[PDB]
Design a protein around this ligand. Structure first.
Ligand SMILES: O=C(O)CCC(=O)C(=O)O
Ligand SMILES: [Mn+2]
Ligand SMILES: [Mn+2]
Lengths: 272, 252
């Protein structure tokens, strides 16, 4: 797993991403912004009841971020490097923006919580493993640290070469060896949907491991969150245009449109 | 390699024909519904203007007959369950395409070029898109009936022999995204070939129409629950933290 500062050119960061399916970006989010956001979402996180048994076994998952945290909708969402890398991954010259959000979720592995099974994120699109290691990307998660990731508080366990394996399968597996995603608040891993990984078991006793996941998918795929339905137009009018398209308030013809027109015309976001 | 079945035909006998040839269903939509629907969308279609083809998608808001009768077709869902489910399908688009006198032939294509990676998955790939292309007015060799190619789905690598899609009002052609086809030249002087397209796609795929964002909720409440999920007003995809989006919108 290579590592870059977020001051590094996008061509550089994305090259390691293509090769290994997986890069680490240091200060991908400014640590002051991450702690404002984290502070802002805290009354809501406290209001979440942990379950013990499931992917929600002693894990907090919370997606109401753009509606709850001003720092998220105004500053954290407006990451230029993210869009450079997303552009390079998903977009074709002349087709607009080739990507949108699948989900934007804070995941907090509680203490004692168990190692999540080794999966690929692209198992969500069941057919995608068949196109093989040389398939186009469907999914890229920018899995960010809100609080520190240690090996023992549940840092994501990643397999670096998974990106290029012979047969991408449901991990029916013939090899049935993982590395922790150690990082500091503000860092992030940028992970292909081809990369095998899973949450780590939080062996600590009070270290609530908090993360901020930006799950992005190609324009032609349906997201797990019905964002433009449950986000209010009040918040949407505070987002930048590229961010409104991230959440399905714009079409920025091809998909998610109104008779070939952008849906944002209908919603008032675009005026002729 | 192209078969025709009634609408009383057993859905598997219909799905078995779809599967190997990539199926015609006579009387898919009852002719009297299709007739009334076409009457309701007619003012709005009057209100529309080198390509000499009219396309109209605001069917759920325009037409009570479509909204309440034509959308509720139990055979359309029996077949989509057999094609997509492991509700594992939703709508891609609902369009009235009306080809006008003199309009040229449209280029042959597979509908699944919309998801540009699907052809690479070959002729044994899972289905991404099913179109139920139902005839509103009659289709004839003259007025530009669709040209289709029946075995072109099963081809190893995804000027050409074809069949015209001859049908009466109410008949559908149920067509895989893998099937090559194209509207014909409308050579008539007066025959506006009107058609009704149900483009359906599997649940993991995005639609070209942002239905739940332009169909008003005054309409959305007068859809059956399966038809609300068809249009994106219910839901695991398209949710609200795993919870059904239907709740937050008040329909559940
Ligand atoms: O939190 C982690 O370490 C991984 C989480 C993950 O992979 C998921 O939420 O699907
Ligand atoms: Mn995952
Ligand atoms: Mn077509």
């Amino acid at each position: 797993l290579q590592k870059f500062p977020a001051t590094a050119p996008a061509d550089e960061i994305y090259a390691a991403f293509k090769e290994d399916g997986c890069v680490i970006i240091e200060g991908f989010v400014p640590p002051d912004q991450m702690a404002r956001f984290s502070q802002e979402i805290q009354p809501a996180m406290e209001k979440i009841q942990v379950q013990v048994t499931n992917s929600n076994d002693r894990v907090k998952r919370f997606s109401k971020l753009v509606t709850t945290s001003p720092t998220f909708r105004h500053e954290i969402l407006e990451n230029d490097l993210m869009h450079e890398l997303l552009q390079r991954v998903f977009s074709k010259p002349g087709e607009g923006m080739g990507y949108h959000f699948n989900d934007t979720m804070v995941i907090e592995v509680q203490p004692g919580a168990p190692a999540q099974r080794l999966h690929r994120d692209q198992e969500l699109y069941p057919w995608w493993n068949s196109m093989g290691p040389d398939a186009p990307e469907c999914l890229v998660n920018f899995f960010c640290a809100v609080t520190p990731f240690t090996v023992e508080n549940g840092a994501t366990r990643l397999v670096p070469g998974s990106n290029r394996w012979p047969e991408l399968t449901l991990i029916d597996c013939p090899q049935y060896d993982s590395v922790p995603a150690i990082m500091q608040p503000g860092d992030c891993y940028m992970m292909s949907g081809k990369v095998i990984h899973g949450a780590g078991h939080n062996a600590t006793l009070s270290d609530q491991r908090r993360a901020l996941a930006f799950s992005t998918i190609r324009r032609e795929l349906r997201p797990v969150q019905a964002f433009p339905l449950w986000i209010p137009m009040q918040i949407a009018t505070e987002l930048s245009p590229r961010t409104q398209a991230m959440f399905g308030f714009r079409s920025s013809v091809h998909f998610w449109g109104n008779d070939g027109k952008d849906i944002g015309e209908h919603l008032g976001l675009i005026s002729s």
